[PDB]
Amino acid sequence: SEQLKHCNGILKELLSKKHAAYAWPFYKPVDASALGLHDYHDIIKHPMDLSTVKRKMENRDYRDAQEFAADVRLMFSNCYKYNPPDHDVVAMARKLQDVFEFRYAKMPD
Ligand SMILES: Cc1nnn2c1-c1ccc(-c3ccc(N)nc3)cc1N(c1ccc(Cl)cc1)CC2
């Protein structure tokens, strides 16, 4: 699938050194206990992160680009739901989503 190759390219870019200064909070699943966020899993019903997206891509879990996009956008939405809007991590999410949305928009079709 041409479109899933494009998705995989986006994924690689989101994980690349170019964006690491703001992407790193999204690299792994939120470890709420380790971070002291003992209300995280009461607020967030469907955790998501880039390592999970990568695993799903490697396992051929995604059947289309929209399913991939749904997971990436869910990851950002969780950040916007859990954190106050002026939190540093929300600023990082907005920057990484801008990277994602502009390249996702270039999807071959
Ligand atoms: C994703 C996500 N969505 N909401 N949060 C996080 C998040 C996820 C992982 C980490 C993390 C911490 C340490 C570490 N070694 N690895 C990873 C930190 C997070 N937060 C967070 C706070 C502040 C700054 Cl500036 C950035 C990040 C706030 C909580």
Side-chain angles (χ1 to χ4, degrees), residues 24-26 30 35 37 79 83 87-89 92:
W24 65 262
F26 308 97
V30 174
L35 293 173
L37 316 172
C79 189
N83 296 281
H87 194 295
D88 292 322
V89 70
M92 299 164 80

Coordinates of all heavy atoms in Angstrom, one line a residue, residues 24-26 30 35 37 79 83 87-89 92, ligand 1:
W24 N 9.8 13.4 22.4 CA 10.2 12.4 23.3 C 9.1 12.0 24.3 O 9.1 10.8 24.7 CB 11.5 12.8 24.0 CG 11.5 14.0 24.9 CD1 11.8 15.3 24.6 CD2 11.0 14.0 26.3 NE1 11.6 16.1 25.7 CE2 11.1 15.3 26.7 CE3 10.5 13.0 27.2 CZ2 10.7 15.7 28.0 CZ3 10.1 13.4 28.4 CH2 10.3 14.8 28.9
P25 N 8.3 12.9 24.8 CA 7.2 12.4 25.7 C 6.3 11.4 25.1 O 5.6 10.7 25.8 CB 6.4 13.7 26.1 CG 7.4 14.8 25.8 CD 8.2 14.4 24.6
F26 N 6.3 11.3 23.8 CA 5.3 10.4 23.1 C 6.0 9.2 22.6 O 5.3 8.4 21.9 CB 4.7 11.2 21.9 CG 4.1 12.5 22.4 CD1 4.8 13.7 22.2 CD2 2.9 12.6 23.0 CE1 4.4 14.9 22.7 CE2 2.4 13.8 23.5 CZ 3.1 14.9 23.3
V30 N 2.7 6.1 28.4 CA 2.7 6.9 29.7 C 2.8 5.8 30.9 O 1.9 5.0 31.0 CB 1.5 7.8 29.9 CG1 1.5 8.4 31.3 CG2 1.6 8.9 28.8
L35 N 5.4 8.2 37.0 CA 5.4 9.6 36.9 C 4.5 10.3 38.0 O 4.5 11.5 38.1 CB 4.8 10.0 35.5 CG 5.7 9.7 34.3 CD1 4.9 10.0 33.0 CD2 7.0 10.5 34.3
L37 N 1.3 10.1 38.2 CA 0.0 10.5 37.7 C -1.1 9.4 37.9 O -1.6 8.7 37.0 CB 0.1 10.8 36.2 CG 1.3 11.6 35.8 CD1 1.4 11.6 34.2 CD2 1.3 13.0 36.4
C79 N -3.2 13.7 25.4 CA -2.4 14.8 26.0 C -3.2 16.0 26.2 O -3.1 16.7 27.3 CB -1.2 15.1 25.1 SG 0.0 16.2 25.8
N83 N -3.9 17.1 30.4 CA -3.0 18.2 30.9 C -3.7 19.6 30.7 O -4.4 19.8 29.7 CB -1.7 18.2 30.1 CG -0.9 17.0 30.3 OD1 -0.2 16.9 31.3 ND2 -0.9 16.0 29.4
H87 N 0.4 23.7 29.7 CA 1.5 22.8 30.2 C 2.5 22.7 29.1 O 2.2 22.7 27.9 CB 1.0 21.5 30.6 CG 1.9 20.6 31.4 ND1 3.1 20.2 30.8 CD2 1.9 20.2 32.6 CE1 3.7 19.4 31.7 NE2 3.0 19.4 32.8
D88 N 3.8 22.6 29.5 CA 4.9 22.4 28.5 C 4.6 21.2 27.6 O 4.9 21.3 26.4 CB 6.2 22.2 29.2 CG 6.7 23.4 29.9 OD1 6.5 24.6 29.4 OD2 7.2 23.3 31.0
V89 N 4.1 20.1 28.1 CA 3.9 18.9 27.3 C 2.8 19.1 26.3 O 2.9 18.5 25.2 CB 3.6 17.7 28.2 CG1 2.2 17.8 28.8 CG2 3.7 16.4 27.3
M92 N 4.5 20.8 23.4 CA 5.2 19.8 22.6 C 4.3 19.0 21.7 O 4.6 18.7 20.5 CB 6.0 18.9 23.5 CG 7.0 19.7 24.3 SD 7.7 18.8 25.8 CE 8.9 17.7 25.0
Ligands
LIG1 C1 2.8 11.8 26.6 C2 2.3 12.6 27.8 N1 1.1 13.1 27.9 N2 0.9 13.7 29.1 N3 2.1 13.5 29.8 C3 3.0 12.9 29.1 C4 4.3 12.5 29.4 C5 4.8 11.3 28.9 C6 6.1 10.8 29.2 C7 6.9 11.6 30.0 C8 8.2 11.2 30.3 C9 8.9 11.7 31.4 C10 10.2 11.3 31.7 C11 10.8 10.4 30.9 N4 12.1 10.0 31.2 N5 10.2 9.9 29.8 C12 8.9 10.3 29.5 C13 6.5 12.8 30.5 C14 5.2 13.3 30.2 N6 4.8 14.6 30.7 C15 5.7 15.6 30.5 C16 5.8 16.7 31.4 C17 6.6 17.8 31.2 C18 7.4 17.8 30.0 CL1 8.4 19.2 29.8 C19 7.3 16.8 29.1 C20 6.5 15.7 29.3 C21 3.5 14.9 31.3 C22 2.5 13.8 31.2

